[PDB]
Design a protein around this motif. Structure first.
Motif, PDB file in Angstrom:
ATOM      1  N   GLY A 131       0.710  -1.273   0.064  1.00  0.00           N
ATOM      2  CA  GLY A 131      -0.024   0.047  -0.129  1.00  0.00           C
ATOM      3  C   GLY A 131       0.824   1.334   0.037  1.00  0.00           C
ATOM      4  N   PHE A 148      -3.682  -8.940  -5.583  1.00  0.00           N
ATOM      5  CA  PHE A 148      -5.111  -9.152  -5.825  1.00  0.00           C
ATOM      6  C   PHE A 148      -5.245  -7.702  -5.253  1.00  0.00           C
ATOM      7  CE2 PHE A 148      -4.505 -13.722  -5.928  1.00  0.00           C
ATOM      8  CZ  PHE A 148      -5.625 -14.252  -6.924  1.00  0.00           C
ATOM      9  N   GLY A 149      -4.758  -6.535  -5.961  1.00  0.00           N
ATOM     10  CA  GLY A 149      -5.040  -5.471  -5.365  1.00  0.00           C
ATOM     11  C   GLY A 149      -6.419  -4.920  -5.041  1.00  0.00           C
ATOM     12  N   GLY A 159     -11.376  -3.807  -3.795  1.00  0.00           N
ATOM     13  CA  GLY A 159     -11.372  -4.379  -5.001  1.00  0.00           C
ATOM     14  C   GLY A 159     -12.370  -5.075  -5.377  1.00  0.00           C
ATOM     15  N   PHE A 160     -12.319  -6.434  -5.610  1.00  0.00           N
ATOM     16  CA  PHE A 160     -13.099  -7.394  -6.272  1.00  0.00           C
ATOM     17  C   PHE A 160     -14.535  -7.274  -5.389  1.00  0.00           C
ATOM     18  CE2 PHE A 160      -9.342  -9.067  -7.579  1.00  0.00           C
ATOM     19  CZ  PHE A 160      -9.392  -9.965  -8.310  1.00  0.00           C
ATOM     20  N   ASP A 184     -11.595   0.502  -2.685  1.00  0.00           N
ATOM     21  CA  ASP A 184     -10.615   0.576  -1.871  1.00  0.00           C
ATOM     22  C   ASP A 184      -9.562   1.667  -2.335  1.00  0.00           C
ATOM     23  OD1 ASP A 184     -10.006  -1.074  -3.813  1.00  0.00           O
ATOM     24  OD2 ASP A 184      -9.130  -2.757  -2.700  1.00  0.00           O
ATOM     25  N   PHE A 234      -6.432   4.532  -2.511  1.00  0.00           N
ATOM     26  CA  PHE A 234      -4.988   4.409  -1.885  1.00  0.00           C
ATOM     27  C   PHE A 234      -4.391   5.866  -2.382  1.00  0.00           C
ATOM     28  CE2 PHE A 234      -5.795   0.253  -4.099  1.00  0.00           C
ATOM     29  CZ  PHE A 234      -4.791  -0.390  -3.579  1.00  0.00           C
ATOM     30  N   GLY A 280     -19.347 -10.271  -6.087  1.00  0.00           N
ATOM     31  CA  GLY A 280     -19.923 -11.141  -6.660  1.00  0.00           C
ATOM     32  C   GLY A 280     -19.256 -12.214  -7.361  1.00  0.00           C
ATOM     33  N   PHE A 281     -18.069 -12.501  -7.110  1.00  0.00           N
ATOM     34  CA  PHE A 281     -17.195 -13.417  -7.700  1.00  0.00           C
ATOM     35  C   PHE A 281     -17.937 -14.546  -6.885  1.00  0.00           C
ATOM     36  CE2 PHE A 281     -14.729  -9.735  -7.814  1.00  0.00           C
ATOM     37  CZ  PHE A 281     -14.178  -9.691  -9.277  1.00  0.00           C
TER      38      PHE A 281
END
Lengths: 9, 9, 9, 9, 9, 9, 9, 9, 9, 9, 9, 9, 9, 9, 9, 9, 9, 9, 9, 9, 9, 9, 9, 9
Positions: free
Chosen positions: E3, K8-9, L1-2, L6, L8, M1-2
């Motif tokens: 980060g 997996f930022g 993310g996913f 998030d 930075f 939603g993975f």
């Protein structure tokens, strides 16, 4: 070194 | 082989 | 002499 | 590493 | 880092 | 605000 | 001879 | 480093 | 006034 | 990781 | 798979 | 993310 | 939603 | 760094 | 005479 | 490597 | 010396 | 040698 | 007035 | 040897 | 051979 | 029939 | 037939 | 593989 590979290094 | 006086570093 | 950082394989 | 000759290999 | 910033030396 | 990774002299 | 407030941050 | 001449050799 | 890490060698 | 991999993330 | 070294930022 | 945002910096 | 079976790595 | 014959002074 | 001022004569 | 097969994978 | 340096005198 | 005269033969 | 080394005859 | 020959090295 | 005579050969 | 003094190897 | 103070030195 | 009668004198 005379027949056998000497390595004075 | 490597019959010589070898340093490697 | 100063053989630094050798990575040998 | 700060004058160190470091590898990270 | 992940980060934050980081340098090598 | 704040400095960080800092090599110096 | 530096001499004032310097704040190596 | 600062005023004292270091010598990292 | 030498001052470094001179190796007379 | 000499025989391996690394990330530095 | 040995897919390693991911963020997996 | 996913899953979610998030930020930075 | 993975959501479905998934390998992250 | 190998002066085998170094005369000095 | 290297830092020391010799007198070989 | 030197005198060795030494496969990484 | 048959392998290395003399330095006579 | 160094200071003394030399001779040979 | 040392006459040093000498080889006669 | 002031009678016969020499060898150096 | 200085006041006599010699045969080095 | 002096062979004489001689280094070898 | 040398005959005096010679100072062969 | 020398092999005769050779008289290293």
């Amino acid at each position: 070194g005379f027949g056998g590979n000497d390595n004075f290094g």
